Amino acid sequence: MLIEIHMIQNHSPANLNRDDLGAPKTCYFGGVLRSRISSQCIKRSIRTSNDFKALLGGVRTRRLADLIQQEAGETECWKKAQEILNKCGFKTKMLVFMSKDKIKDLARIVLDNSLGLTEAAQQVANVIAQATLAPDIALCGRMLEPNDKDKDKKVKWSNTTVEAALQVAHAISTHIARPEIDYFVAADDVPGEDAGAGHIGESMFASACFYKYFSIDWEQLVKNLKGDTNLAAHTVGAFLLAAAKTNPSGKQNSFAAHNYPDGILVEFKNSPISYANAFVRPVSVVKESDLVEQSIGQLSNYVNDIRLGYYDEQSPVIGFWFSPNNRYPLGYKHSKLASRNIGNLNELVGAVLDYIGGFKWEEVQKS
Amino acid sequence: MLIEIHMIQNHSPANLNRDDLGAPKTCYFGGVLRSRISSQCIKRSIRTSNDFKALLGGVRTRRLADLIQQEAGETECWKKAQEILNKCGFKNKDDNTKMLVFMSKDKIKDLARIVLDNSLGLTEAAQQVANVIAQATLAPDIALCGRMLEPNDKDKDKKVKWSNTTVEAALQVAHAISTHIARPEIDYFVAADDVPGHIGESMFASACFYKYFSIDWEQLVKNLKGDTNLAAHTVGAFLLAAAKTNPSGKQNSFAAHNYPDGILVEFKNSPISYANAFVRPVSVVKESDLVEQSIGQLSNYVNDIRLGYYDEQSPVIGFWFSPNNRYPLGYKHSKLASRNIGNLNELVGAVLDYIGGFKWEEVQKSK
Amino acid sequence: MLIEIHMIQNHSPANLNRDDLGAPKTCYFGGVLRSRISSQCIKRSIRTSNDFKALLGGVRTRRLADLIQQEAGETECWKKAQEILNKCGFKNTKMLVFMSKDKIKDLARIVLDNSLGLTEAAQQVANVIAQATLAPDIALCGRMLEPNDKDKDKKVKWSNTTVEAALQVAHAISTHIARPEIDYFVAADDVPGEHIGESMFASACFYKYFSIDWEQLVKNLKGDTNLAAHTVGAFLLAAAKTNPSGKQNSFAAHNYPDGILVEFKNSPISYANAFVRPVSVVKESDLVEQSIGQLSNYVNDIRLGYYDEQSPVIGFWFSPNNRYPLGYKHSKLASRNIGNLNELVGAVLDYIGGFKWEEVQKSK
Amino acid sequence: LMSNDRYTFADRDWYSPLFSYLHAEGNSRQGKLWLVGFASDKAKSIDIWDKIIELEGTDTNDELLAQLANRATALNAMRKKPLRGDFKKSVGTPQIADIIPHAENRIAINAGKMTENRGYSWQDADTEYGELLTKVAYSLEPAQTVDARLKRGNFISRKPWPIIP
Amino acid sequence: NRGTVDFIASLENLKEGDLGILRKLRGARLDEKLPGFDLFSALWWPLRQKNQRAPKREVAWLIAKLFAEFRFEQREGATLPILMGGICRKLEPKKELPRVLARFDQLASLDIMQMEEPLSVIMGILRKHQQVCLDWVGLTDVLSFWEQEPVKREWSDSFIKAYKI
Lengths: 367, 367, 364, 165, 165
Fold this sequence. Notes:
5 chains; A: 8-stranded antiparallel sheet; two-stranded antiparallel ribbon; E: mainly alpha; 10 helices; globular
């Protein structure tokens, strides 16, 4: 089975993702240009959030020898750590994505042994490949490739590939993109000779309402975390809580984009169905409504049409809907698209966890 | 822990911020045009103010040589200090001295002392100047706004090494957005001559703005090396500032020194923005006004976020203030603010009490 | 300390300030239309007032050569000065100049008939002109003069000619909705023989706000505190005893203000958000009474809401013959209530530091 | 069968054994020069082709024949150019990699005329890229600004450049 | 096209008070204020009765607002992407040219309801650069079909060709 989240959020003028030149990221959907926030930015912000802080047991880095030397008080294990890294096949050094404690303890106890370089390199490769008990590894996956150009021909590598269990698409505006440019000049505190004109810089920004899309596979999440079951549900609840309550950390010091969404639809499938095509037609603001209500109304229309379209009785689907204080109804006219209108995030987490299985949020806060 | 200040202020027809040609800054929020005041304008008007005179300390300039010569009096040392600043790494591409230097002004005497030594040459004096600047970060303004400074590797001496120069900022300020449609006008002017013996254009706008400030208490305390007393004084003087300052641009032609009609001070562990309340522009009717509709929609969004998002195990406490309670909050709820007060001095008293317990005179007498 | 002048004044049906088309200028405050009189019109109307005649210093002209020409010896109309001023950059355009009255005449008419020649007297006129700051109208209004770095002599240097303004002026807005009316005029003929007219006008009661700095005034008068009170007194008589000089031959709008609040406070406060709600007439009361009452309510709210310690802002409320009270609620909003302008002037000067009106006129 | 970092797939290489046949064995003579190109790597054949070109012996410019013997690096450098800025290990404009073979095969009919430089030159061969490349510029910049058409105009001025060594 | 020409002629037949009343209604719709609605109806609705291809209510209202604000003289051959392009040459190529170009190319992302302030500042830089002539009929005919690619495709093309001269 699958767990699916739909999400409608409106943002203040900001720059939550920029390219090399210094402008907001943009896309072309349905023949017109729209603002964009990259998916990987969202996964990074969720991974480094404060509602996910219990759940980082791993590292994605190339400074493994800093971590090995940090697993020491006084013993000089810097040159030998880098050395065994270079005979390992990580030669710029390759980015390695594995758990913290496993590499820390095992590199501390293996690098400090007086054994051969080949055997200790084989053991380091084995413990790097075997340290696949980490939550970000299960959510986001892992691929590592030993560079055979400079690799010793004695030892052999093992299976290391990790299949991920989270699929998030890029954040796409519900309407046309309207880019803007801001001109700044710096000043001098003390008067003096001063400039001729004053070199004008340029800061690009825009504002938009975003439709975000989330998908969670429970079976692969269970299979990646071995025989554990409670950790899967706790990860699902923690990810929902974080993604509901985390923003990208862009230029937030001068563009405070701390808004929170006005509508969350949650769903359960066996097959992934994305509802991004509700906004192929651009949304034109009319005098009556606002951008948010028309966006969720068009989303409701597409949801209603798909629910009355591709629909099999042998596998029926259900879902709950959430809004703050229940101000924005999905079924604006007559349809009851969701059965369990919920006015709070905590009760939504409890309902999702109960639908997964016999789990309570206070129960699984121990793994 | 975060201190969050939300502010509503209506402004007279005025030109507080502008682009190159004289137009007020405009924004694209909610599908409609919004008037905009840049956040850097607000930060600089806070920094240069009568209430923030005592907690000064940081200076930002490109004319270190002039102040150094003034500190060291009659010593010449102009060309020598200019050469030392060139050798330090201050880039001089396009024959322009730039890279606005951010250091405290109580360490200028150390710069003049190290530069005016005769035992050491020029590489030594430049390295010592670099060590002085990279460890002079003990001002309220550097603690609040933060600092970044990247001298170039091209024109610097090879034998100069640069230490850690970054300080993370403790203040986040959003761009000011009007609550309704943006409506610029054009003014026409001619030059009068007194002795007897054409037309141009200027642009102005009037709007009621929504402002948002955020202060991180632990980062401010960490920035001042554990001086909790000075951090409390910084928060209090900043609140007095952001209440009682207006940006100084074209204030000689339109003296818009208007005061806020409502400030909400809240304490929470997560950043909260109320910008989505005005996603629908406020349409002025006969029976009401712009301002009270703005505060009414703000109160409605405060209810929605309070009963929809903030309901956790961690409680959120906020106070509301209006001058002599002239604009109360939402009429149908009447329970949003924990305390309703009619003075700003009691506001800063309550805030300083809620942080760690502080009296206004004991924090005033620390600088 | 800063001195604030807020005034509410009703005007006759008139057109005191016009755009290019022939309409009064209009502005948008609080979501509805309001009429508008610009800042520079009020500044120049106070400037030309008879109460400001005795302290009138400054020229603000752009042809200095004709003012140089006052000497009898006809040698400086088309002189080398018509090329030396060009080497000064005062160029098309001619780069208008905010300098004094006696200094230019005396010193220039000394130096511009000299055997110095080119590239020597331009420096002298620069030293006379870029230092000609001592004038009260400059002291309040400010000064600027940036020259053409592409059309001036290379051997001449410039000192500072930047004078910080001690006066801040806001535009005049209404307290009620703007109601534009079109008047049709038909011009007749004095001789019989074998054209409908399109002009606009309006009437409204207006609200204005000015600020003057005291220490900046004293500083820009080079430490002369004696002139920097005669200045403020002449300004106070002018802002209350002078209407703008628009179409006044057909619109006699010589009205006197009905409510003036004069305050003394360290930081400037604008009581302009009292008039977010337009004043709507009712059968009981008029426009002046409701406008002054709303101003009273907002003044009380600000005063009771923004302080609890010291600074009992000793501000004076002026109403002619105490005609319109500052609110019919709980009293004691203003320190004293004055039914005369000259008693107000004496009290304000007494707050300045004991300065007497009968003794300060001898300054200039 | 692959367009790696040091190769770009254009057509058969009739330009390799030319600044060579024309100086050591065979020389310049009148007839039909048949080219057999048999590729290999280790022990596996990948592609074998044939071709026929017409010559008579119309003089020789050694420099131009040398540039003609070195053309695949010029194509790699034309493909590899970034759209804007510069980045290490940047592949660069892969739609140009799609349109290289058509202009190459339109050029390759008069190989015997390019070899002797009778009427067809490097600059005459340069013009063939314009139509396809103007077709590409619409897709790679599908915007409606002044900057869009100006970038297309800069983009249509991209031509291969000759490299002798 | 006929019907436009009489609409522009009736716009030029207006007097001081009518231009002022459409000037005070800048930045607004029509349904809020009744004198503006009545004046626009009396100036527009007979043409829509007689001619089917008379301008839409929104585009006619917007063009009426711009004419009341700027009051340019009607003359054929003074269209907007020509005067833009004749103006752009007199600026510094390093700084001011991208600044003007960005404000000019921002129009391809805005709707007719949102195209009042950029047009206001563009005719502002015209009035600053001492121009008195403008083709209003061409602008109305391109705004009425502003949502088609060839119309903005010939927009900046007229621009490029006027700028390159």
